């Protein structure tokens, strides 16, 4: 999963 930013 990619970080929020």
């Amino acid at each position, epitope marked *: *999963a*990619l*970080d*929020k*930013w």
Partner: antibody
Amino acid sequence: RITLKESGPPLVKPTQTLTLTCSFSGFSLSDFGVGVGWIRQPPGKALEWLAIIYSDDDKRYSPSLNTRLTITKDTSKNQVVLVMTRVSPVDTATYFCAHRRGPTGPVNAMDVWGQGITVTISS
Amino acid sequence: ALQLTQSPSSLSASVGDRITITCRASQGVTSALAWYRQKPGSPPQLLIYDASSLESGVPSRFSGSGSGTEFTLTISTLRPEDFATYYCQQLHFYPHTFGGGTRVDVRR
């Protein structure tokens, strides 16, 4: 400015649940993109990422501890709570909560940390 | 899982020395890497964010560089208060991994 402080039981029994609270001031979990994460450190070991919660209740947990952790936030009290179940002696460590800046680059770090609370797991 | 490898894990130096320390990531993390200094008994303290940005209030001797999978933290001239443990952290992928740390002690 921003400050955070971890509180909870310094002593916890093997098998029992650990509940920790992060109380903060100087900022608020309402303000967009802001996050409050938890990081632990076993005596003499390296830092270990536990979880993080954001302004929009968005949430993430460390995969390995996912079925044992629950993180929540109460905007009325500026507190973030971490609940860790079925703890064992290996969970003995210093638990820190930290602040993560929101989109103003500066989001790439945990800029302010609590003093940390020492938790010992023994029967 | 994404692994962050710090090298060297332990390093001895003297006041006035120039040292450079590295953090390697198993996968590209763009510029999402932070460096922290941790003195014993105290919590980690942010030095560099976004891989190369010097955090406000942090002394000029500290600097960072890198992108993708390779990153470094350099201390132009270490001071007595720099004998501590340093950690890097990537915030590109969840979970937000920390490296194993680099211990800097006094050489004799």
